[PDB]
Each structure stands twice: as C-alpha cells, then as structure tokens.
Amino acid sequence: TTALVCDNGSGLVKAGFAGDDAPRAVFPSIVGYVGDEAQSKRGILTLKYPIEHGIITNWDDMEKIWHHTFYNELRVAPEEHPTLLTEAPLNPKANREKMTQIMFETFNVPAMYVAIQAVLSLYASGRTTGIVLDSGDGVTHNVPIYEGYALPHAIMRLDLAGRDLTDYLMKILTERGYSFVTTAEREIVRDIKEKLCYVALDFENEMATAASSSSLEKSYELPDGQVITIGNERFRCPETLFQPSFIGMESAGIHETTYNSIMKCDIDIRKDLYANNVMSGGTTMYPGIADRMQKEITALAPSTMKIKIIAPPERKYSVWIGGSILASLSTFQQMWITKQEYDEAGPSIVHRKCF
Amino acid sequence: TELEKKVKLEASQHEDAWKGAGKQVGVEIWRIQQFKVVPVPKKHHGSFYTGDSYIVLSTYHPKTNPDKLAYDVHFWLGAFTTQDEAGTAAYKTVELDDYLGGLPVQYREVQGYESERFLSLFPGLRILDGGVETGFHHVE
Ligand SMILES: Nc1ncnc2c1ncn2[C@@H]1O[C@H](COP(=O)(O)OP(=O)(O)O)[C@@H](O)[C@H]1O
Ligand SMILES: [Ca+2]
Ligand SMILES: [Ca+2]
Ligand SMILES: [Ca+2]
Ligand code: NA
C-alpha cells in the first residue's frame, strides 16, 4: 500500500509515490482539458489558474486538477492510496477543510494529510531549524522553523515569483526588437529565463560591464531557427527578486524579507536562522543567487554573524521530496485522518490532526 | 497547540526505538536504515558510517539537579548520506524530542564539523567507509 504525495503548486503540480526520490508527474496547474492536453487545444478554450499566489481559489477547477493527477497522470485508484497534500504557509482554516472535503467525498481516499510546504523542504534538507525561502511560480515565502515547528507570526509573503519574472523578461526583451506575444512564445521566454538568466553579485557593476563589453552576451537558438542575442537582460530579470521596483511593486526584496522574518523571532534562535537559510522553489535556481543572498544578508546582519545559504541541487522538488520522506514514516502516517474519522466528525477534523 | 502536542505525542508512541530510551544516564545510538530507526549495537557505538545518518541521545545529569535527567539529542549526518536518511533523522529527532516531553535540546551534527558537546560523548570517534543503501527508489 503506497502513499501518494501531491504538491499543489501555483504553476506546477508535483505528484508521485511516497518512497521515490523524485515526482513521477509534473504538469502545469492550468484548466481549460488540463495541463499539456490543454496547452495544445489552447485556441478553443480559456486557460485559468486555479492556484494563484499559492491559495486555491476555484474548487471546481482544483477538483479537475486532482482528477487529472490521479487518473490521467499517475493512473491510480484514489480509493486505495493514502494521500499527502501540500499547502501554502498561513493557509486559512476553511481552505484546509475543503481540501479534506474533496479528498474524502469526491475521491474517497482511505487516509489524508495536508502539510506545510516549507516544512517539507527543511526536512528534505536534513534540518529541523532554519528559515526557508520558497520562491515558486506564484508566490515567494520566508518561513522560519524551530526544532520542527514553524513560526507563523514571522512568516513573510511576497506575491512575486517566476511567473512575474517570465513576464518581465518578455518585456525587456522587446528593447532589442524581439517580439514574444503568443502563448507558445511565452514558453520560449520561460526557457530563456531558466537557461541563461543569473543573479549578479553587484548589480550596478554588472550593468556597467554589460555596457562596456560584450563578454556577458549569450546566444539562444529559437525553435524556428532564429538565433537571438541577450545581454544585460540575463541578470536584469532575476534582479526583481531583490528590487521589486523593477515591475512597479513597492515591496522589499527577498534579502530584506528574509532579514525581517528573522527579526520577528526570538533573539535566541536568530543565530541559528542566519546559518540555515534554505532555498526552495524553481525561482531560487538562478546561478549566483546564493552568493548574492550571502552578500546582502551579511550587509544587514552583525559583522560577526556566521551566515550560510543552502541551495540543494534539486530544490525544484524539495517540497515533494520532503513529503515523500515523511509519508514513508509509519509514525507520520499515524496522524493522518482516516475515512472512518471523517465520516464521524466531518471536515473540521483537518484542524485537529493536520499541522 | 495543546491539541497539536497531543497528536504528536500519540504519534511518537508507535516507534519501538524510543521504548526504553533516556531511562538512565548514558549514550544511546540509532541508525536510519531505509526510513527505519534501527538501534546500533553497543559494540559499534562511536563508529559512524560516512554515508549514513544517525540519532544520538545523550542522557545526563543537569547542573541544576544531580538526581534528575536531562537530554541532548544529536542527529549526525554523514558526508555521503542520502536525502532520505538525513530527512528521516531530522524528523525522528523531533519525534524523540516530543516523546520525551520537549525536554531534549536538538543538535545538528555533520561529519567533520561536530560540536564540542557531541565530541565529548566519546573518548573515540571513528568514521567508517560505506553505509547502508538508500531507501529511495530512483525515478528514471
Ligand atoms: N533553472 C531555473 N532557473 C530559473 N527559473 C526556474 C528554473 N527552473 C524553474 N524555474 C521557475 O520556477 C517556477 C516553478 O517553480 P515551482 O517551485 O514549481 O513553483 P510552484 O511550487 O509554485 O508551482 C517556474 O515559474 C519556472 O519558470
Ligand atoms: Ca510550491
Ligand atoms: Ca546510506
Ligand atoms: Ca525540545
Ligand atoms: Na509532464
């Protein structure tokens, strides 16, 4: 009897079996047809995002995503699999109850549990104490955890992630004359973002370097054969993570939200949080983002503070991997809500077992 | 939070590795073996495999009372341990912490950078090559 791990992301669903080292199903969280089957017949229906900024808003489209996960992607009978779901930090109590309601009444799972995404990434990094920087497609979070328990009052939220970074790269790529408009071209911009972008150590010195020589220029061959050249757009795109003003957002950068999130904790544990900055999410994959985060946090912290940035090589799935590890432990599954307990208490039991 | 402690404590009762732990002053050692907490034989205490993750429970007498028991729980991460073994050791450390009523203080030890509190548990500490195979199933 294998447990199911489904990471409901704002842009990508990560699903698979507990005990595996990687999710077996990764598809976009888009409804139309769902995912790859919907991006093909895109000129017929409208594509909506059921999970914008990490919170599930429309439950009918979410039900379609979960149905697509169980039957079309993983090809499993939901009635024969305990299922572990993930949620964004500070998830409302009602939104947790609806997840339990759909899992038991619509899919009839024998057991269910909803876990915090950032806590799974910390466990996946082999830690019980630390502050997680989870930057995915729709939302970016700073979540401190001490000895296995998250600190909700210090959690920072920033509605700026990979989706906005893709659009900002699309915008600045027009300066060189390129035009990426169609839905197919937006996937090419995402590919350019994931392949050639990087975080500058000193932004102003790289801006002057890009204007001084052509050593930072990179070439990229489009599917139609056209070869384009990209310059300072490589590091101007992920710079929005540290300067949200690049897209007109009056918010603090990821380095400041991390620093602020630490300051909202007890002084005894700040020393441990500075040495355990765990990065999670696909938007934390830019080369050089750890060195830049190291440089910015050092400038904000006391001079004697030992600071360490942890960037796991597969932090793109660290949320799911931590779920696969925890769901492989029998004592963890013991806390899961069984179908009998749901049939007795109802949907409010998610707040009595899931933490 | 008081109901959270109730279910976390009830969950820790289903691990046989904690039955009898922290009962007397000493050092108890477990090794993570394919998502399972396996006790390390006494003859092998102090020898840790560079590719595995361990849980080390140090029961001692606190300075504030020589007739009482305090706990220092350390999970030791080998330089070549896999993600499953390190993550299970981290979670099970919190689980043993809850099993003993939150009293244990948690320490994260990595090979070659262990704290003085952890090194003091051995007169002594020998690192061995190899380790138990990962519990992960590889996805091609
Ligand atoms: N190597 C990379 N470099 C830059 N961005 C990346 C890379 N890999 C993935 N991303 C971005 O990360 C986002 C997906 O991250 P993910 O953690 O799956 O988000 P969520 O969990 O919210 O679905 C996408 O927007 C994608 O563009
Ligand atoms: Ca996510
Ligand atoms: Ca091993
Ligand atoms: Ca404790
Ligand atoms: Na896919």
UniProtKB/TrEMBL annotation, chain B:
Entry binding sites for Ca(2+) 2: D97, G102, P104
Residues that bind Ca(2+) 1: G51, D52, E85, V132
Superkingdom of this protein's organism: Eukaryota
Domain Gelsolin-like: 35-119
Family designation: Belongs to the villin/gelsolin family.
Name listed for the protein in its UniProt record: Actin-binding protein fragmin P
